[PDB]
Amino acid sequence: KQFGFPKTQVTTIYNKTKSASNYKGYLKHRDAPGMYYQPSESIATGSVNSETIPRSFMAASDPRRGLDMPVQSTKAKQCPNVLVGKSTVNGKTYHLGPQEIDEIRKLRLDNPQKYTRKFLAAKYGISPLFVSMVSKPSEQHVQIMESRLQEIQSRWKEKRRIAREDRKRRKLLWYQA
Amino acid sequence: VVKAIARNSIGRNGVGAFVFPCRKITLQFCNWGGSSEGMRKFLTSKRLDKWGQEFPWIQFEVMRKSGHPLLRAEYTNGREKVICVRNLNIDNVENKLKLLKDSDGDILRRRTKNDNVESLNSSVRGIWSPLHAAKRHR
Amino acid sequence: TDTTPLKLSNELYAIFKIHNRPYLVTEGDRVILPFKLKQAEVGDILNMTDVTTLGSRNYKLVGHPINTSLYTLKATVVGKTKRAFQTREVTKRRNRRVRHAKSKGDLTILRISELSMN
Amino acid sequence: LCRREGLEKPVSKLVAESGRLSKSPVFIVHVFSGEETLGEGYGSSLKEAKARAATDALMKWYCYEPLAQQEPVIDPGTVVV
Amino acid sequence: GGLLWKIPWRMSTHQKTRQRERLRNVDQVIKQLTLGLHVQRCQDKGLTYQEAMESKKKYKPRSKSLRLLNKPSVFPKENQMSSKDKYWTFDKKAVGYRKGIHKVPKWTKISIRKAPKFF
Amino acid sequence: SQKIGHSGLAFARLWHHVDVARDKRTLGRLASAIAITLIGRHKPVYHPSQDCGDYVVVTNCQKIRVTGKKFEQKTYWSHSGRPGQLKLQTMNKVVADKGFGEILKKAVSGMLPKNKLRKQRLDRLKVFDGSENPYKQNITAFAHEQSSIPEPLKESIFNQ
RNA sequence: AGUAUGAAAAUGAUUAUUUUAUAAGCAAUCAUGAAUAUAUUAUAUUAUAUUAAUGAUGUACCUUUUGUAUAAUGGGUCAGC
RNA sequence: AGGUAAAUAAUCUAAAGGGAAACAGCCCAGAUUAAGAUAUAAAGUUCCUAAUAAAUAAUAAGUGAAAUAAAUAUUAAAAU
RNA sequence: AAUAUUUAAAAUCAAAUAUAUAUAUAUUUGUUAAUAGAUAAUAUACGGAUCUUAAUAAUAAGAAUUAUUUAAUUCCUUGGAAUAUUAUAUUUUAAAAUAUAAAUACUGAAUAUCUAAAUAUUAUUAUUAUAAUAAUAAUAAUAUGGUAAUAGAACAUUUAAUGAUAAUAUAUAUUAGUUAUUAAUUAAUAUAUGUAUUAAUUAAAUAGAGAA
Ligand SMILES: [Mg+2]
Ligand SMILES: [Mg+2]
Ligand SMILES: [Mg+2]
Ligand SMILES: [Mg+2]
Ligand SMILES: [Mg+2]
Ligand SMILES: [Mg+2]
Ligand SMILES: [Mg+2]
Ligand SMILES: [Mg+2]
Ligand SMILES: [Mg+2]
Ligand SMILES: [Mg+2]
Ligand SMILES: [Mg+2]
Ligand SMILES: [Mg+2]
Ligand SMILES: [Mg+2]
Ligand SMILES: [Mg+2]
Ligand SMILES: [Mg+2]
Ligand SMILES: [Mg+2]
Ligand SMILES: [Mg+2]
Ligand SMILES: [Mg+2]
Ligand SMILES: [Mg+2]
Ligand SMILES: [Mg+2]
Ligand SMILES: [Mg+2]
Ligand SMILES: [Mg+2]
Ligand SMILES: [Mg+2]
C-alpha cells in the first residue's frame, strides 16, 4: 500500500440490491471532495489500461511498477490447475538421445497403426506431442486419415455442419482480444 | 503466432485540428419573381461582403435562376442542406444563412432522453461483472 | 491532494457539469448539449470549469468543482444544430379541433479535444 | 515470452466458476507466473477461458504504452515461437 | 350509492406526517408575520435590523386577527394540538361526532385546529 | 463510453444457492428477495426490455418459515372455468401434494412482473424440499472460499 | 354514353424482406435488441429506410348529452359530388 | 334513494397531468414548444411498481393490510 | 384478595407554553383491548403476491397490521454542541488507539426553477435601412388548457387583370433529404409537354369533407 486513499463502492443513494440500474440514485450520491480508491468491478481481459498491466510486463524504469494498482487479489496456491499439461505439473525431461529418436522414427514410418504416437509415448516415457515433433508418419497413413475425416464430415447432417462452423467462428473470436 | 486484422482509423474532427463543417454556400435568386426580393436586397446591400470577410473558409457562390430563391449549403461530410427562402425579408434570409453556417452537415435525427455523449473509446473503468463486483450478491 | 495515480494513468474520464447537467467523457468523446449556445460560436473552445469527478480505472478525484489548476478539459464547439422536427397532435375526445404541437429543439455538438492532469 | 524474460513458467488456474452443467457457464481462469497473475480470462468453456487469459497476457505484453517521462523503451523483438 | 368514491375512513402514516408538516408550516408563517411586524416597529422607533432581532422585549401585534392567531386557545400550534384534532374534524351528523380531516374538502389548504370542548 | 467493452460477463446467468434451513426469513420475504434476483434488478446492467436475471436454486425447502396459523388456514385457489369447480386447497394440503417448494414457487410467481418473460423467470427458480439436488455442481464458487470447506467433502460433492 | 392518356385509391393474386406456432385486448406511440436493404466521403466502432424479439404507456372516431370505451346516434371501403 | 327542491364554495361542464386498483364531479395541480439538472404537491417507498430506515406501545384475531356493521354477550386491562 | 362502579384530564394530578417570575396567574396536552354478534346464489378477491419470526448461526430476517412519533441519540438555543453508531484510512498488538466522512431520508406531476426555442404585450438596448418608423437580434417582466361564442393572421385550390423566362426547362407522380413544415423546396427516377394566365400584387369564388 503506497497510497492511503479512502476506498468507496460505486454508491447509490437508493437500495443497490433492488435498484442497481437506476442512474438517478448514482447521480444523487455526493461524496466529500478528495482522492478515492474505487476498485474496478470488472475483469481485466480486454483492457490495455496501465492500471491493468502486470508489473513484470512494465519496464524497469516505469514509475508505475512501485504503485500498488495491479492488485494481486487472487492467490495461485488457492486456485487449481486448468487444462495443464503433464510436463508443467512434473517437469520437462530431455532424456532421449539421438539413437532412441532414430529408432522411434523408424518405427513410426514402418507401422503407424501398430506403433501409434500414444504407444511410443508409453514406451519412451515422453509426450505424444514430442513424438509428433520428432517423427513424421508415412504420408499414405496421413492421406488415409484425411480421407476418413472427410467421410465423417460427409456423414453429417446440415445442422451439424452449421454447428461446427459456429464453433469454429467462436474459436476464432476467442483469440481476438 | 500473431496476425493483424486490416482496420481503418476514425476521424474525430475536433481533437487535433478543427476543420470547419460548412465549406460552401450558394445564394440563388431571380431577377424576375417577387419571391426573390429579400434575397436580391441582401445580395445588393453590403451584408454578403461582411459575411465573406467574417468567414473566409466558406466560399459564397451567387447564382441566378428562374425559380424561387435558394440557400444551399455544402458541408465537410458531403451532405447538402437546401433552404428555400421564398418571400423572406433581408433579415430572415441572413438568419437562415447563419443557421446554415452553424450546422454540422449531418442529417436531423430524434434523440432519446440523455443520449448525450458519443464515444469511440472503450470504458476507462471496465464493464461490470457479477464475479468481480465489490459487494457479492447474497 | 496526491493526484499522482490519475496523472500516471493512460485512460482517464471526467464528469464535467454544464448547467448542473453531468456529462461523463473521455478525450475524443462527442457531447450533444440539448440547447442553443449563444456565447460560443462554431470553432470556439470551451474550458470546462465545474468538473465534479476526474477518474482513472481504480481512482477518482472529486471536487465541487475540482480545482481548475489540477486538470485541463477543452471542448470544441463542433456545430450548433437541431433535433428532428416532430408534430404531436393535441385533442380532446369528442372535439374535431386538433391542435398540432410542432417541435424542433436545438442542439449543440461539442467535442472533448483535451482531457489531462496538469 | 516467459522463458525469454526472467519469469516463472505460466500456468492457468480456475479463480471462479459458475453454471458448469449449463448452456452458458462462466469460467474465470488466471494465467499465473509464480504468484503474479499475467492474464485474466473469462469463458463459456474452461479451454476458452484459458485461451482468453493467454491472449490477455499477450495484449498486456505488446500494447504496453509507457509514459513520456520514462526513458525510451526499445523492445527485444517479437516473440518468435 | 352505486358510484364508488373509494376514500378510506382513516389516514395513512404518511398522510398524517404531511398533515403535521402543513400544520407546522402555518404556525411558522404566523411567527414570521409577527416577527416582521416587531422588526418594523423597532426600526420605526429607531433600531437597526440586527438590534431589533436581538431585542429582549418583542412587540405583540396590534391588529385583531394576528393577535387571535398568536393566542393558543384560539389557534393552537401543532406541538400544542391534541392527536385527535390533527386528524379528526367535528362532524355533528357522524357517529362519534367525528370525521377524518382528509374527508374535509380542500383539507390541504383549509385550516381547522380547534374542535368544541367536549366533541 | 461507459457501455463500451466486453459485456458477456455482465449478462452472464449466475446460479444462486439459498439453503432455506440456514435462512431466517419468512416465506413471503424470501420469495420477494428471490423475485428481484430472478428479474435481474440486483445487477446494474439491467434494462426492462431485456431479460437478464439469474438462476436461483432453493434447497432444504421443508424448513421454510411460515408465521401465524397460515400453514393450516391459508387457502390456495384454482378454477377451470366451468362453474362449481372452484378448487380451494389449504397450505398444508398443497405441501402434502407437492411440497414446500411448490408453495415457494407460487409466492415467487406472484412477486414477478406479469408479462412474456414471467414464465422464463419462474422456470429459472429451482426448488427442492430436501438437500440433494442436481444443480449442486453449478452454484457460483471461488478459489478463495475453498480453504473453509474440508478436503473430502468437496470430492464427495464432485462425485455426486 | 366524346377522344386520348392513366404507378389515383379501394380490391384480388403472386414474389421479396422481415416478424410470427406458451400467447390475450383501438393493433398505435415511446423505449430497445436483432435481421435485411440502400448509401460514387461507410474514414467506422458509419448513416438512413423496412420489419408486431422484448419492455412500458395506451377505454376508435363523430353526434347528442349533466355525463358515453359504452351494450346511445351514424358510418362496409375508396374515388368523385 | 346514484331521490327531489332550492342556499354557499369547489370541480366537471369546457381541463389534459400525478394520486384515489379501474374512476366527468374526490385529493393535488391548470398542457405555448422542448429539455430533464434542481426544488417539490397530493399520494407513496417488501415484490408486482418509481422510492425507507428508525423509535415506543398494542394486537395474535390474518383482526387488519385505501370502501371501518349495530344493539348485546364473553374474556381480559386500567382507575376508583 | 373480595364486593360494586367508572373507562374519565370537567375536577384532580403530571408535563409543557405565556405574563410578574425559584412562586403566582392564564392557557395547552395526557384516561382500554380482544373475540363473538357477521349472513346467497358464474370464482378465492387487501388491486394481486404475500405480511405476525426463531436461540444454536450467519459481513444478513424478525409486520408489509393498529396508535403516537422521528429522520442516528441526548442536552442547549431552523441552528450549534456532545454522545455513541456505521463506513473508510492509518498506526499498533481478529482487536485497540487516532482521524475523515455520513448525518441535508427518498420517490413523485405536462407544478416551480434552471436550461434553450416561439408568439403577444410592457420597459430598456443594439444592428440594418408616423427614423417619434420598419425589419432583425438582445436583456428583465407578465401572459399563452379550452366547448358555446367573439376577435386577429395565414396557407392550399380555381378563375380574371399585369407578367420575365425555357427540353440544361416546366408540370404531375414516387422515394429520400431541407426549412419550426396543412406548405414549399433539393436530388434521383418515370411520363408528358417546345411549354406555365408561372413569381409577386390585386380582384373574386361551385375555395378545403371520416361524419347528413
Ligand atoms: Mg424498486
Ligand atoms: Mg379528437
Ligand atoms: Mg363533452
Ligand atoms: Mg415461441
Ligand atoms: Mg387474441
Ligand atoms: Mg362491442
Ligand atoms: Mg356504437
Ligand atoms: Mg351502423
Ligand atoms: Mg340527481
Ligand atoms: Mg354542453
Ligand atoms: Mg381531469
Ligand atoms: Mg375552470
Ligand atoms: Mg396555462
Ligand atoms: Mg383480512
Ligand atoms: Mg376493504
Ligand atoms: Mg384540563
Ligand atoms: Mg366472493
Ligand atoms: Mg393496495
Ligand atoms: Mg410549466
Ligand atoms: Mg387558447
Ligand atoms: Mg365546394
Ligand atoms: Mg372524398
Ligand atoms: Mg379530417
Side-chain angles (χ1 to χ4, degrees):
Chain A
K1 289 280 283 189
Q2 187 86 316
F3 305 116
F5 303 131
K7 113 173 179 286
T8 54
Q9 279 66 34
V10 187
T11 310
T12 54
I13 65 157
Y14 313 142
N15 195 328
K16 199 171 187 180
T17 318
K18 283 156 164 174
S19 56
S21 56
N22 198 340
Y23 86 98
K24 200 157 191 164
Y26 291 99
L27 208 144
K28 290 292 204 309
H29 178 264
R30 186 196 148 285
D31 56 332
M35 277 289 294
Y36 287 105
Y37 168 48
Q38 269 201 332
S40 60
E41 304 182 320
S42 62
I43 202 169
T45 301
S47 289
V48 176
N49 203 315
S50 57
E51 303 202 326
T52 268
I53 286 157
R55 298 162 216 281
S56 281
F57 298 170
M58 292 175 181
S61 65
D62 199 342
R64 301 200 224 76
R65 266 178 166 279
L67 292 329
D68 67 325
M69 204 53 261
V71 190
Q72 198 56 59
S73 188
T74 58
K75 296 180 185 177
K77 295 160 181 177
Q78 298 182 312
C79 303
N81 287 300
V82 50
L83 269 50
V84 170
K86 290 176 282 203
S87 335
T88 309
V89 178
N90 47 95
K92 292 174 167 185
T93 57
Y94 309 85
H95 71 269
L96 296 174
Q99 301 109 315
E100 287 90 320
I101 286 157
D102 189 31
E103 287 170 32
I104 289 155
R105 286 169 56 75
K106 180 181 157 61
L107 286 156
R108 219 220 156 130
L109 286 157
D110 278 27
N111 202 350
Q113 296 187 333
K114 184 178 176 180
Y115 297 109
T116 193
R117 288 165 52 254
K118 185 176 163 189
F119 183 84
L120 268 305
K123 186 167 175 184
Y124 292 104
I126 215 51
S127 181
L129 171 53
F130 180 63
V131 166
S132 180
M133 198 189 308
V134 164
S135 53
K136 294 191 179 180
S138 56
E139 67 184 42
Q140 186 188 130
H141 188 247
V142 173
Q143 288 275 302
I144 268 57
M145 230 44 65
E146 190 61 36
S147 188
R148 293 253 210 74
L149 188 270
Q150 289 285 314
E151 201 277 335
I152 288 158
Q153 285 179 316
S154 190
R155 226 76 153 285
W156 297 340
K157 298 287 194 150
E158 180 103 314
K159 280 194 174 181
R160 175 153 279 191
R161 197 190 70 256
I162 289 160
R164 291 286 134 99
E165 218 74 357
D166 290 11
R167 175 188 290 177
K168 207 139 190 158
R169 292 291 95 74
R170 291 183 225 117
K171 199 95 92 184
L172 187 61
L173 195 69
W174 303 347
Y175 301 117
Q176 293 266 318
Chain B
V1 185
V2 59
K3 298 183 170 179
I5 302 162
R7 221 171 274 283
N8 283 319
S9 54
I10 336 294
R12 315 110 97 190
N13 184 36
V15 307
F18 179 63
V19 180
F20 199 94
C22 187
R23 290 205 269 84
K24 175 168 185 176
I25 297 169
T26 315
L27 298 312
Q28 192 192 290
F29 73 97
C30 191
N31 281 316
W32 194 80
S35 63
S36 315
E37 179 60 282
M39 171 64 82
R40 273 188 256 112
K41 295 259 186 179
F42 175 82
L43 290 168
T44 309
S45 305
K46 307 184 178 172
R47 302 207 178 189
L48 183 45
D49 172 40
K50 282 177 183 177
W51 257 79
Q53 215 72 235
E54 194 168 18
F55 311 109
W57 46 83
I58 302 166
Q59 69 195 75
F60 288 83
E61 188 169 53
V62 178
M63 190 185 180
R64 190 208 59 75
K65 282 190 94 289
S66 62
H68 282 285
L70 257 49
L71 289 180
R72 56 153 52 76
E74 197 176 59
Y75 302 95
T76 51
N77 69 339
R79 299 196 67 76
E80 183 199 49
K81 286 202 195 287
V82 188
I83 297 170
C84 181
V85 298
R86 70 200 295 286
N87 297 294
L88 293 183
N89 63 47
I90 299 156
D91 301 58
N92 289 336
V93 166
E94 190 154 52
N95 292 0
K96 247 61 177 151
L97 203 70
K98 187 184 287 86
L99 168 281
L100 278 174
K101 82 128 181 46
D102 281 315
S103 188
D104 63 315
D106 194 35
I107 192 171
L108 273 66
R109 176 191 288 92
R110 298 216 299 114
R111 332 287 330 293
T112 186
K113 190 211 195 76
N114 291 315
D115 192 358
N116 306 327
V117 308
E118 305 196 328
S119 189
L120 300 168
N121 305 57
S122 63
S123 186
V124 174
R125 306 181 66 77
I127 301 298
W128 181 82
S129 173
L131 287 325
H132 303 79
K135 189 73 70 60
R136 190 185 161 187
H137 189 221
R138 298 189 290 183
Chain C
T1 54
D2 187 280
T3 332
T4 65
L6 275 287
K7 199 154 187 172
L8 287 167
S9 62
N10 56 12
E11 296 211 39
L12 199 145
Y13 74 87
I15 319 183
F16 77 94
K17 297 217 287 280
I18 290 179
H19 297 297
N20 311 68
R21 314 311 207 273
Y23 301 92
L24 200 149
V25 295
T26 62
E27 93 290 16
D29 285 19
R30 179 185 178 78
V31 186
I32 304 164
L33 301 177
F35 64 98
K36 192 172 177 190
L37 254 179
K38 293 187 177 179
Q39 302 95 314
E41 291 291 342
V42 174
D44 295 348
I45 303 165
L46 313 183
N47 286 306
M48 298 300 159
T49 313
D50 197 284
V51 179
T52 305
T53 305
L54 232 45
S56 187
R57 166 171 247 265
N58 294 290
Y59 305 91
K60 71 188 207 297
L61 182 63
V62 21
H64 329 300
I66 296 167
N67 264 318
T68 310
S69 303
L70 299 173
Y71 63 84
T72 79
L73 177 46
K74 293 199 155 171
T76 304
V77 180
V78 179
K80 280 79 169 289
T81 189
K82 286 173 181 168
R83 295 157 180 277
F85 176 93
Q86 301 171 237
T87 36
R88 55 134 191 173
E89 71 172 29
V90 179
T91 184
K92 302 285 155 287
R93 218 212 191 77
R94 278 156 288 277
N95 184 24
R96 294 172 176 181
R97 189 153 186 170
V98 177
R99 181 173 128 279
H100 303 113
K102 63 170 169 60
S103 63
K104 192 181 196 181
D106 298 289
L107 302 171
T108 303
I109 283 66
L110 305 182
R111 174 142 261 156
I112 303 297
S113 61
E114 309 181 28
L115 171 50
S116 287
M117 310 306 282
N118 187 27
Chain D
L1 181 272
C2 291
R3 255 172 283 159
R4 192 171 73 179
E5 269 55 33
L7 306 180
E8 289 160 279
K9 63 178 169 55
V11 326
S12 44
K13 310 182 166 284
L14 256 188
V15 178
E17 172 267 297
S18 187
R20 178 198 305 260
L21 322 180
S22 82
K23 180 78 149 156
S24 300
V26 49
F27 295 106
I28 311 299
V29 311
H30 278 203
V31 172
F32 296 88
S33 271
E35 300 301 314
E36 184 173 40
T37 189
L38 304 182
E40 312 174 21
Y42 73 92
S44 189
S45 75
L46 288 171
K47 159 193 286 282
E48 173 176 0
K50 184 191 173 189
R52 277 224 160 81
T55 61
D56 178 30
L58 284 165
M59 281 295 192
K60 284 153 164 173
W61 176 251
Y62 287 127
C63 314
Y64 168 70
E65 53 175 304
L67 298 105
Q69 71 179 253
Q70 293 184 241
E71 55 252 50
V73 179
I74 294 88
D75 71 320
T78 313
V79 180
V80 182
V81 73
Chain E
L3 192 66
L4 175 48
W5 296 112
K6 183 146 97 157
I7 186 168
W9 76 280
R10 57 181 164 194
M11 298 162 56
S12 51
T13 52
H14 308 108
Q15 273 190 72
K16 287 169 164 168
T17 56
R18 283 184 231 108
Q19 166 66 357
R20 271 174 272 156
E21 187 55 40
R22 281 197 291 281
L23 291 169
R24 206 170 296 111
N25 292 348
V26 174
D27 298 327
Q28 175 55 217
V29 165
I30 288 161
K31 174 172 171 169
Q32 286 294 326
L33 286 174
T34 59
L35 186 271
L37 286 160
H38 154 237
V39 168
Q40 192 63 86
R41 220 195 290 189
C42 287
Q43 286 180 343
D44 292 357
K45 283 161 177 283
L47 316 184
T48 58
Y49 183 96
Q50 292 193 44
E51 281 173 39
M53 294 294 277
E54 288 292 340
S55 304
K56 296 161 187 172
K57 196 258 171 145
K58 306 295 183 197
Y59 297 128
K60 310 303 180 195
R62 298 292 84 216
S63 58
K64 170 221 187 80
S65 60
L66 270 153
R67 204 255 303 154
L68 286 157
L69 289 166
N70 280 36
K71 286 208 294 189
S73 185
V74 179
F75 190 87
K77 303 189 82 195
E78 188 270 315
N79 66 81
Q80 290 168 348
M81 278 173 78
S82 52
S83 151
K84 195 153 175 52
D85 288 30
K86 291 168 187 180
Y87 314 131
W88 303 92
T89 38
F90 166 73
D91 184 48
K92 69 179 211 178
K93 61 191 175 180
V95 71
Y97 300 125
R98 284 288 195 167
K99 192 221 301 195
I101 307 251
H102 71 295
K103 302 258 220 183
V104 174
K106 279 59 163 189
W107 76 294
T108 318
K109 294 100 179 294
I110 284 159
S111 63
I112 172 158
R113 312 308 201 78
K114 203 78 187 175
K117 192 172 176 176
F118 312 114
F119 299 87
Chain F
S1 190
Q2 300 101 291
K3 292 159 41 157
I4 300 165
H6 296 312
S7 57
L9 266 160
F11 291 112
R13 293 245 148 74
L14 291 203
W15 289 68
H16 295 296
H17 186 226
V18 38
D19 193 346
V20 157
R22 290 311 307 285
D23 199 351
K24 309 186 95 162
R25 290 194 273 283
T26 201
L27 162 69
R29 295 169 195 277
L30 176 55
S32 185
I34 288 159
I36 281 149
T37 309
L38 257 52
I39 293 154
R41 303 302 308 285
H42 67 285
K43 68 179 73 177
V45 136
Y46 179 86
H47 195 247
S49 81
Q50 162 166 34
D51 191 303
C52 56
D54 299 11
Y55 289 85
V56 172
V57 180
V58 176
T59 255
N60 291 311
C61 203
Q62 70 193 120
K63 268 153 281 170
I64 203 158
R65 297 153 128 85
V66 169
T67 53
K69 302 179 192 172
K70 295 181 234 184
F71 200 69
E72 57 256 30
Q73 282 197 52
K74 194 208 198 312
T75 190
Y76 289 93
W77 74 272
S78 164
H79 207 289
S80 60
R82 189 217 224 75
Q85 305 301 145
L86 182 76
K87 184 163 155 119
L88 283 152
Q89 313 193 260
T90 46
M91 186 182 254
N92 60 333
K93 211 280 192 204
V94 169
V95 158
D97 280 17
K98 282 90 125 188
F100 292 84
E102 181 58 34
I103 294 293
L104 182 60
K105 230 170 171 49
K106 261 172 132 59
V108 171
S109 193
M111 304 283 161
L112 285 172
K114 315 300 179 285
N115 59 34
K116 290 142 165 264
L117 303 168
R118 171 157 176 227
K119 282 215 207 205
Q120 299 171 26
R121 291 180 209 297
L122 205 290
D123 171 54
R124 292 199 202 88
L125 176 65
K126 309 293 190 190
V127 196
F128 294 99
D129 282 359
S131 179
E132 71 182 47
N133 69 299
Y135 313 115
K136 219 176 280 178
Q137 209 172 119
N138 77 16
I139 291 150
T140 197
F142 297 91
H144 71 81
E145 287 187 313
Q146 295 311 265
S147 186
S148 184
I149 304 159
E151 194 170 39
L153 287 181
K154 302 182 194 157
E155 285 175 16
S156 187
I157 289 155
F158 193 54
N159 261 233
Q160 256 173 320

